Amino acid sequence: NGVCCGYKLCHPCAG
């Protein structure tokens, strides 16, 4: 769906 930032690292959440 897009990019998500969590543990100081942004990565695709679920496309």
Swiss-Prot record:
It is found in: Secreted. The modification 4-hydroxyproline is found at P12. Disulfide bonds join C4-C13, C5-C10. Expressed by the venom duct. The cysteine framework is X (CC-CX[hydroxyPro]C). Chi-conotoxins inhibit the neuronal noradrenaline transporter (NET/SLC6A2). Activity has been described on both human (inhibition of norepinephrine uptake is IC(50)=1.26 uM) and rat (pIC(50)=6.21 corresponding IC(50)=0.16 uM) transporters. Acts as a reversible non-competitive inhibitor. Exists in two forms, due to cis-trans isomerization at 59-His-Hyp-60. Failed in phase II clinical trial by Xenome under the name Xen2174. This structural analog of MrIA was developed to overcome the relatively poor chemical stability of Mr1A in solution. Initially intended for treating neuropathic pain, the promising results observed on rat transporters did not translate when tested on human transporters. Belongs to the conotoxin T superfamily. This is Chi-conotoxin MrIA. It comes from Conus marmoreus (Marble cone).
